[PDB]
Design an enzyme around this catalytic site. Structure first.
Site, PDB file in Angstrom:
ATOM      1  CB  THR A  40     -28.714   6.910 -34.447  1.00 27.84           C
ATOM      2  OG1 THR A  40     -29.858   7.749 -34.729  1.00 27.84           O
ATOM      3  CG2 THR A  40     -27.886   6.338 -35.529  1.00 27.84           C
ATOM      4  CG  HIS A  45     -34.937  12.487 -35.868  1.00 26.68           C
ATOM      5  ND1 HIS A  45     -34.656  13.282 -37.088  1.00 26.68           N
ATOM      6  CD2 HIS A  45     -34.007  11.878 -35.503  1.00 26.68           C
ATOM      7  CE1 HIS A  45     -33.407  13.255 -37.021  1.00 26.68           C
ATOM      8  NE2 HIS A  45     -33.111  12.186 -36.318  1.00 26.68           N
ATOM      9  CG  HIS A  48     -34.735   9.367 -40.152  1.00 22.45           C
ATOM     10  ND1 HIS A  48     -33.534   8.973 -40.360  1.00 22.45           N
ATOM     11  CD2 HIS A  48     -34.598   9.662 -38.669  1.00 22.45           C
ATOM     12  CE1 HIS A  48     -32.844   8.774 -39.100  1.00 22.45           C
ATOM     13  NE2 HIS A  48     -33.558   9.221 -38.089  1.00 22.45           N
ATOM     14  CE  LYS A  82     -24.004  10.287 -37.468  1.00 21.61           C
ATOM     15  NZ  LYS A  82     -24.383   8.717 -36.879  1.00 21.61           N
ATOM     16  NE  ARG A  86     -22.874  11.540 -32.243  1.00 21.76           N
ATOM     17  CZ  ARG A  86     -23.347  12.411 -32.856  1.00 21.76           C
ATOM     18  NH1 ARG A  86     -23.246  12.413 -34.325  1.00 21.76           N
ATOM     19  NH2 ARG A  86     -23.922  13.503 -32.296  1.00 21.76           N
ATOM     20  CD  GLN A 173     -24.133   4.153 -46.761  1.00 21.75           C
ATOM     21  OE1 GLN A 173     -24.018   4.449 -45.851  1.00 21.75           O
ATOM     22  NE2 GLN A 173     -24.911   5.023 -47.683  1.00 21.75           N
ATOM     23  CG  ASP A 194     -25.244  12.905 -43.926  1.00 24.23           C
ATOM     24  OD1 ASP A 194     -25.890  11.863 -44.704  1.00 24.23           O
ATOM     25  OD2 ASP A 194     -25.615  12.947 -43.077  1.00 24.23           O
ATOM     26  N   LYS A 228     -30.740  25.341 -37.424  1.00 29.72           N
ATOM     27  CA  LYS A 228     -30.789  24.008 -37.899  1.00 29.72           C
ATOM     28  C   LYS A 228     -32.278  23.532 -38.001  1.00 29.72           C
ATOM     29  N   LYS A 231     -34.478  21.648 -35.256  1.00 33.12           N
ATOM     30  CA  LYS A 231     -33.891  21.821 -33.883  1.00 33.12           C
ATOM     31  C   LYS A 231     -34.776  22.963 -33.065  1.00 33.12           C
ATOM     32  CB  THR A 232     -37.995  21.926 -31.490  1.00 30.76           C
ATOM     33  OG1 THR A 232     -38.382  22.020 -33.021  1.00 30.76           O
ATOM     34  CG2 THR A 232     -39.010  22.263 -30.613  1.00 30.76           C
TER      35      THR A 232
HETATM   36  N1  LIG Z   1     -25.461   5.508 -43.335  1.00 34.42           N
HETATM   37  C1  LIG Z   1     -26.708   6.056 -43.424  1.00 34.42           C
HETATM   38  C2  LIG Z   1     -27.830   4.625 -43.223  1.00 34.42           C
HETATM   39  C3  LIG Z   1     -27.352   3.568 -44.165  1.00 34.42           C
HETATM   40  C4  LIG Z   1     -26.902   2.330 -43.643  1.00 34.42           C
HETATM   41  C5  LIG Z   1     -26.527   1.129 -44.521  1.00 34.42           C
HETATM   42  C6  LIG Z   1     -26.394   1.369 -45.851  1.00 34.42           C
HETATM   43  O1  LIG Z   1     -26.498   0.556 -47.018  1.00 34.42           O
HETATM   44  C7  LIG Z   1     -27.004   2.693 -46.420  1.00 34.42           C
HETATM   45  C8  LIG Z   1     -27.387   3.737 -45.580  1.00 34.42           C
HETATM   46  C9  LIG Z   1     -27.084   6.846 -42.163  1.00 34.42           C
HETATM   47  O2  LIG Z   1     -26.213   7.015 -41.181  1.00 34.42           O
HETATM   48  O3  LIG Z   1     -28.165   7.389 -42.289  1.00 34.42           O
END
Ligand SMILES: N[C@@H](Cc1ccc(O)cc1)C(=O)O
Ligand SMILES: N[C@@H](Cc1ccc(O)cc1)C(=O)O
Lengths: 317, 317
Positions: A40, A45, A48, A82, A86, A173, A194, A228, A231-232
């Site tokens: 993304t 960052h 993660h 979100k 996006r 996913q 999430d 958050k 969140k700096t």
């Molecule tokens: N959906 C997760 C990333 C993800 C992508 C594919 C997957 O199979 C698993 C996780 C995210 O937005 O952080």
């Protein structure tokens, strides 16, 4: 058993599909687990790190981790966590970002270990070449619209609005878990808070195609002030030293409020329980010393940038 | 203008996206229109004749018709006008059925005409090779889940249940219209009553990708007794003479109730208004003669099976 009890103590367990079933399996076998990361941006960052370091913890306890780079899914975008739809990034952009992300992921895992060396994978490899028809029939037939609408990520957005594009993300996913389950014996998927829905979607698909596997989520990192995490005033605290220097990275952690410091040591560090506890007592007895804060700062900066980088950060300060 | 006024008089117009806009265009240009037919069996049936013959009417008035064989979509299945989720047919099955369907379609249209000769197309050609990612991004981004849920075909089924497979069907039909609009200058789509949503979805996609085109639907064929048109004790009245012989086909029409006969002449035949009206007066004055019924029977059997077939039917009776 003790791995899972340890994560619990640390506060790295938000939810689990079946704790006793998973504890059993962790305790009886070398488990293949995975975590997915979508490009993304051109860098990961601090948002993660919880997931990343948790993988590491899993690896240290003798399990085999698979880091999945979202080459395909990063082209769709996950509505999860979100509030807004996006913008679609270009294939070239995503492709370029995936390569970098792959690099930062590799730093945190072990490739030399025999028995449980990691794997970095890209879902583009199995989603890229999949035709719509195959997708709608082989994956789609398994899901009712009613199951999907009830998902937190969608539920949270129907009034706000959500395209079919993002609505379908879960299927992809879902599919990743199935494929990894089949080709790599992957029995556990982990992710942030999430991701519950996406993970359970994966489990629904396995169950419906095979009739075994588990899901675990990490809680959202909290702040005592209710702001958050990450969140700096400066903006995002990146893992790329060219975006966020080791000095800035280091400073960020050194400025942890006394209220959060102990939750962050447990979350982000490899210090034992007795080490973490001792720091708590030191925090109580001499809080102007900032021993908890320095320890966090050095531990995390070393993890992410290494000792030399840490050394500079310290001397720059 | 007069074509559209004629269809209106016949009762072949259920709904129209914009009657005055469409009348204008029909009157000013040679319009390319299309109708899609999904292989759900190895033969078309009388349930498809309204749409088929309407195409023909369009062709006779100087427009160019495109008959679309649902090679791709027939692999997904349209929930429209269905109270229940359908079983997925195999690729081999559908593939085999498409070939037959193509044959029966061709009987009703003109290929010799210069200026407006028909075209038979198969959506497998552009949907077959489309990758999921392209599909979710190029088509899916254009549709919110909220627009799609409100569709009669979906609305009618959420409690009853509907897979994501069938839920997405509309996207494919949507896409067909766009592609035909682009490659064939197709400005009008026609279909039965239940297709309104799918048609308008197509229009939404064109509008959102181009920013012109129209949609027209034919009403469900009614019976005065309130039973289901084509619902015979014998089962389906097929257009394949090996499933339903010309004699059986002929008999079916000859047994039209006096209550329906005049609506069926208007719908299924090429008799003029003055011919149809005269039969109405004959129906009134001498209803045991069954002149309306014989005329329907001969007209429709000739259309579908030809004169020789009609000749046998008559002599067998
Ligand atoms: N959906 C997760 C990333 C993800 C992508 C594919 C997957 O199979 C698993 C996780 C995210 O937005 O952080
Ligand atoms: N959905 C229509 C057939 C169809 C298929 C594809 C299209 O583009 C248009 C129509 C039916 O079930 O009868």
């Amino acid at each position: 058993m003790d791995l899972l009890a340890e994560l619990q103590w640390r506060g790295l367990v938000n939810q689990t599909t079946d704790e006793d079933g998973l504890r059993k399996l962790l305790n009886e076998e070398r488990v293949t687990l995975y975590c997915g990361f979508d490009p993304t941006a051109d860098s990961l960052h601090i948002g993660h790190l919880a997931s990343i370091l948790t993988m590491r913890r899993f690896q240290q306890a003798g399990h085999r981790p698979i880091a999945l780079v979202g080459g395909a899914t990063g082209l769709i975008g996950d509505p999860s966590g979100k509030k807004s739809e996006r913008t679609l990034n270009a294939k070239e952009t995503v492709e370029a970002w995936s390569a970098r992300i792959k690099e930062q992921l590799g730093r945190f895992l072990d490739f030399e270990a025999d028995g449980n060396p990691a794997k970095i994978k890209n879902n583009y490899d199995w989603i890229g070449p999949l035709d719509v028809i195959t997708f709608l029939r082989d994956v789609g037939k398994h899901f009712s619209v009613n199951y999907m609408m009830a998902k937190e990520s969608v539920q949270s957005r129907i009034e706000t609005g959500i395209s079919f594009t993002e609505f379908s993300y879960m299927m992809l996913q879902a599919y990743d878990f199935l494929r990894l389950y089949e080709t790599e014996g992957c029995r556990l998927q982990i992710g942030g808070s999430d991701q519950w829905g996406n993970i359970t979607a994966g489990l629904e698909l396995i169950r419906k195609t095979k009739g075994r596997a588990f899901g675990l989520t990490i809680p959202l990192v909290t702040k005592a002030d209710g702001t958050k995490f990450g969140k700096t005033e400066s903006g995002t605290i990146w893992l790329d030293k060219e975006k966020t220097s080791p000095y800035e990275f280091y400073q960020f952690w050194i400025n942890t409020d006394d209220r959060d410091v102990i939750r962050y040591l447990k979350y982000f560090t490899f210090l034992s329980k007795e080490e973490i506890e001792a720091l708590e007592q030191e925090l109580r007895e001499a809080p102007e010393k900032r021993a908890a804060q320095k320890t966090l700062a050095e531990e995390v900066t070393k993890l992410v940038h290494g000792e030399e980088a840490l050394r500079q950060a310290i001397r720059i300060s």
